Amino acid sequence: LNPALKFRDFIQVLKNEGDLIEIDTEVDPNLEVGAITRKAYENKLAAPLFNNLKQDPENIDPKNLFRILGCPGGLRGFGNDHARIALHLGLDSQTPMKEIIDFLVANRNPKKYIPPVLVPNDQSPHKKHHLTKEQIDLTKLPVPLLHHGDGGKFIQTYGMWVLQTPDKSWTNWSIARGMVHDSKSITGLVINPQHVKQVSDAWVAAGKGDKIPFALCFGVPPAAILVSSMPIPDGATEAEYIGGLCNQAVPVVKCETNDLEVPADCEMVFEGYLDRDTLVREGPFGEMHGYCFPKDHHTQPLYRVNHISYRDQAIMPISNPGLCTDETHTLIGGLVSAETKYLISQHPVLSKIVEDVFTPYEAQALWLAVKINTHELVKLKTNAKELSNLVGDFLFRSKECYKVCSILHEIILVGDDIDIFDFKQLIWAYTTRHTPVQDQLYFDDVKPFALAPFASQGPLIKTRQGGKCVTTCIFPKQFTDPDFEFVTCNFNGYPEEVKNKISQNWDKYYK
Amino acid sequence: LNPALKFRDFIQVLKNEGDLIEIDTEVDPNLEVGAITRKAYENKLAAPLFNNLKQDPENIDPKNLFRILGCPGGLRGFGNDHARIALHLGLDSQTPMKEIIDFLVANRNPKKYIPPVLVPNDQSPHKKHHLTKEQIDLTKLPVPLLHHGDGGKFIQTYGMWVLQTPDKSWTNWSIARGMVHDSKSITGLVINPQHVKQVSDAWVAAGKGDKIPFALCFGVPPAAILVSSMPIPDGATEAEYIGGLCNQAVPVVKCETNDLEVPADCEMVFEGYLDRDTLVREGPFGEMHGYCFPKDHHTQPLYRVNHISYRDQAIMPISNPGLCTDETHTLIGGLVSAETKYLISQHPVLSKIVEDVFTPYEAQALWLAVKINTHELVKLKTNAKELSNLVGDFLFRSKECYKVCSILHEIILVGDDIDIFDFKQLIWAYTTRHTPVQDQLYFDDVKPFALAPFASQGPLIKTRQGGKCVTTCIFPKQFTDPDFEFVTCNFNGYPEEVNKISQNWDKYYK
Ligand SMILES: Cc1cc2c3c(c1C)C(C)(C)CC=[N+]3c1c([nH]c(=O)[nH]c1=O)N2C[C@H](O)[C@H](O)[C@H](O)COP(=O)(O)O
Ligand SMILES: Cc1cc2c3c(c1C)C(C)(C)CC=[N+]3c1c([nH]c(=O)[nH]c1=O)N2C[C@H](O)[C@H](O)[C@H](O)COP(=O)(O)O
């Protein structure tokens, strides 16, 4: 019935659509879960539900803890390849991505928001079973080693961190990676300018950065995990946008051991204290640009888990990032795209000319294509450098987009003949419409994205400055002549009369 | 059957392989031939042999002049997508392009060459029929208007110009586009630094520039039209190289109205005089980067046609350039890669490290990917900006490559984990391994390629300086640490042992 609000309805729709395979054969958390999911992503196969994982004998409740759903946001192979993404928002599964983005943009006006509603503990399935700190041992759960060279088992790849500011004015829901540190403990990334850091920075500012309450929620409402992955504004409570998107309040319940509220329908909730006063090793991970660099090591804060609540037969969703295409593309890039569309929308100049933006997956969410209406472009009476200075100041440096676009390294301005969602069209335009280096405006005083390989393995990690450009793929005269024409030399570029005769009668030609 | 030496054998082997579609229904040379060929390239369909072109009723011999063969160098839909390129050289049709290129490169040694052999006219099928000047009217032949906004009907898109230097030391076979100017005339591109220009320049040097003898041959031996598209060196005679590649001399015959030699197995030979001091309108054309710019306009020199020889039921092969992939990618791009690879083969530094080079068609032949052996790279005790200057200087400024590599505007240095022939792999490495701008080395004094749309519709068309860069997609430590380690996060990047999944896949999904 409602896959936006209920993880298990999400699973049931995929099963109904023929886009889910239950695997009853024993699969090993050590490396095979990741191989399978990867082969699923890459060939656009059905999402695998792993019912029979190889279990450690000391696991405290193996019949319940846990199965793995993989590829929850991976592309589908038969119809609309973005079905799984549409489904997270409870939309028609054939809703294509450009429209999925319009739906999110459409619902970004705060007047559409609906705050979550508290309900009693017996309306939540995950409140059926409990583990205290003493009983908890994360070492024994079937947490996968997703990639060779991963510095730990990454238990948190598709659940949601719930952190609240000390004054209670902002409750943030987001995704960030997490690996098992020891029996009772998870460490993961907590970096500028991510909200998990902003919010915890507040607890630090008040001298309580050792005992920051957190919940970590697995199998949350699919619309909730989608937004958990979207960079909505600083200070914004994700729950309220999720509500609008669902035209319905997210039902939530209070934790057992802190006063955070978590969704009624989760598979498993982990409760504890984020400890920003103790650093620990958090291991390299195979991430969104397609590498694991096994010798890359750094220290990160520690989440001390004191409690766990979980339902019968818990299912954990999982993301196993690498080459395109996967959740670190469809969700990290798609949702950057959606928020940047919204924000641009509200820009008095950029809203007149920008038709659409999208992060082509082929570029691992390092590029943002920006589709410009040339007719309205002429009216502005501008040029390549000045439009590029405006765009990049806005996307790289504004208080609006400083964080939102932080992962992006190249912005690609193109005219409105190119469906930016079709990479054959984007790559044609990129190689044929910009002079190497000359039509790339370099911004040196911007914060680079530390995960970009070219930065992590280069000098940009030491310097922490620059690395970005805005590339204009719009011919000089497209800025001045509104009747500028070229014929695009493919079949679809022929005159309508010709295409129609040839297409209608193709069987007469190619018999 | 010899598809290297005989066009009709080439056609027969595609037929035999299921990669040919005889079209007997009437197709119009006005836009339709072009629209059908565009759909066939783009969907990698069988090559279309149009048996029934809509004829002007005044054509002097419509049963013979002419049929059209489309997509001769297009990609095939079923096995080795490059099978047509292989058969041009007479190779097994499943020969992959890397291996096609190795073959061309292996045979670049002048030792291996074999000059052509003169045979009597009664050995040439195209000597069966003849047209004198008074009889010729190019405007009644079913020449196609290939793209909307083309300035004229482009008759020459897969034929071979033959021009010989006054001193008869150098004879060049090449492709350059040519449209019909009038009932007796073709105008075509003759621009720097192409050999059509270098060789005709010589006549203008000698003051005899208005009467340069030429032949223009169609349906020439597929190995010859293939080399006709390869930038072999200045002053090198293509016939010799082609013979080497065919392990047989190309049978040639003498033109009727001049002393030029033309392949004996052609469909139609045109003969006449290239007039370098009569410049006429040579209207825009749908070109290799995907665009026809309808109000781009220049003038070009004139080929006056005085004689046509042809054979029963002449076939004209054609190329209808545009979006990837078509002959302006597999041939223009592939052979620039091939000649580049060989020339790099003779460089005392670059041959230690370069495994392959390729123009990915997705980049419309503006990009050259250069695959570098990492272990041998370390031994060079070098870094990004030094290697970039070296590589960029050689391809853009050396007497060896100034012309060869003229079409390329971005050279991309990648390590040897990247199969540079699989664009999925190349674009991964491009986007993720170079910092924009910091890792691009601009060259501002080199000659830009004037066809490139960012040039043609930009200042580079005027300034004729710059427009190019070398882009490093090799991590700094790849140059110093030989054991530099990273895991590729696709399926093929997991340990060989984790076979288990592949061999047992049906147990998971079944
Ligand atoms: C969907 C998704 C997004 C990842 C991501 C992953 C997924 C599956 C993983 C789990 C596979 C592994 C790593 N990723 C992290 C991440 N953000 C971050 O700070 N650290 C991360 O380690 N994100 C990006 C992050 O979720 C977005 O930037 C959100 O905007 C964060 O929320 P916020 O805007 O509330 O800070
Ligand atoms: C296969 C091929 C190659 C084209 C070509 C085409 C095809 C089908 C067309 C017919 C689609 C249209 C235009 N092209 C021209 C061209 N070179 C050139 O100088 N002017 C051209 O108009 N070439 C490239 C040219 O043939 C190569 O650069 C050769 O190296 C030139 O021979 P040369 O080295 O002896 O000068």
Ligand SMILES: [K+]
């Ligand atoms: K978020």
Ligand SMILES: [K+]
């Ligand atoms: K040539």
Ligand SMILES: [Mn+2]
């Ligand atoms: Mn947030």
Ligand SMILES: [Mn+2]
């Ligand atoms: Mn030549």
